[model samples]
Target: MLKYVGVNLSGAEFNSRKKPGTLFKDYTYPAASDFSYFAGKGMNTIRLPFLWERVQPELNGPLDQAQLGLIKKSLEAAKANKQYLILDLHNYATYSGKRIGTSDVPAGALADLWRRLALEFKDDKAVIFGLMNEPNGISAPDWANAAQGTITAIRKTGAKNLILVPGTAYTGAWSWRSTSYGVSNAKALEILKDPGNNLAFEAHQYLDKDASGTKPVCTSDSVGQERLQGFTSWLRENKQKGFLGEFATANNPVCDKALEGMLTYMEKNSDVWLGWTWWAAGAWWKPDYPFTVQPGKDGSDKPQMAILSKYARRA
Candidate 1:
């Protein structure tokens, strides 16, 4: 199993559709050179943020031209940089809701969209098919079956690309077990055959503070690494294929220690698992919000990046 070090290419680089009533949230356009910059950082993979609504736009279907152009541009950049793209279906049109997991999109439509996209890039070695990001309502056999079909469909497209499947309910790692959630590994495995090889699992970790949401604290303080220990512990013990997906920063001493502990485990198991993508790839803080951006270009060099850049390398 090969380890991947990457980031969730979100915000302005992928989605261009107006996010409901929110002030303009289009990220469909990005400079061609950014891909090279990312590649230079020793990053090999990128979770390209994409939305089914943006790609398909309408329910009945008229493929959006502009969205496809933006996607093409991102793809072009990746190809130029020799980076692998994990097509992130950030929003599912099959289900509907406010949060990331809630979507009105149906499973067939989702599958069809993936098939179309995969067919387009059937021979592109840089492309990897990823199911919907952060699926919540869809779990167990439903997710597994849908993913199975999607994977098969993509494979049929003549591309044997690496695929990453998320756990149900926010795609959190802790949601993996049948005991905790309705989803079962058996069902997931049924969809995925080659574990630690072609198929990889995913999870997200956020150590948010109580009052100041943006401020990064130690994992111990936020809730401590103990809270995340189960997730990390399971990943390590199982020797499964996965990525941290996402994690919040903890600048405090204790929380930083906890976060470092998790990193240590990752370093030890880098062969099977991929590295994490720190949240906030773009700037979105407001006049009232203190935690403006963690992954910023300047103020971005937070403790998380420090630890990550220091020890976060693919084995």
Candidate 2:
């Protein structure tokens, strides 16, 4: 069974969108000190978020060397420490509000981005390419088609790194089977395929009733369990694998119980579930963000950390 556990390092990717007076100037790269904090806590992986514009300002053009260099630094850091790192494209299914499959932002352009990335990191097995974060504004079939093209491009570049493919509608687990979205996860599964057989579907599940993770309240313990059942059962039935790429809850005692139940289920069923990374813990997260898992100013563990320790395993 594959055993890996960790949290999202979420600052670098989304910061550029912030106003000039905010916590970020344009964008930020993760520091050694940040890695030290996770390593100190025995967290073994990092889901590093980055933006498409920062990497390639012009579509189908060259990658920004400065931004790409920042990514390489994180890759080297992870390699030195033997940590599994996810290179996440944090765009929420669109670039500048244009969908991927549209004529202006064709899916082929997305594939080109991955082609560059694959060629750059083909030898680094520790680096897993996260194919766009939370794709929305498109049908599941379109997203799957985009994903298939991107994966094919990556493999053509000779990168054998594991790819995490998420469905449309933000890839929320609770809505995986919902028809309110253009196409459900069931449709995504029906179309997505990888010749390398090295891909896993990616999903994000929040314990809140809306599954948005914005509220401080968590749903019942069984709710979290049931949220996962849809994806897990689909994987089992199809003989596929998946990663709970994002999940988190409030820091309350009740939320801790729900967190424990969700993770315990993942641990018990490791055959089809690769592992998970808690929603986030990062420098850019404001103190008020309910799901922040970072330690306090005193360097003491958050309530969720203690719960996560029970399931954390090193590579």
The lDDT leader among the candidates is 2
Report the lDDT of model 1 for residue 85.
74
> Candidate 2, residues 75-146: lDDT per residue as tens digits?
887777667889999998776668897788999999999999988888987899999899988888888888
TM-score of each: 0.77, 0.94
Q: Which ten residues in a row have the lowest lDDT in candidate 2?
A: 15-24
lDDT of each: 0.59, 0.82
lDDT of 1 at 62: 61
Tens-place lDDT per residue, model 1, 1-315, is: 335665555564333345421324545344555565556656666667766766776553666677777777888888887777777777632423433223455555666777778767777778776776766656566766667666766666666677777766666554455445575643464445542256667676665543122465543643534444455556556665677666655456766676667666666656656666545343433333322223445433434555555553543
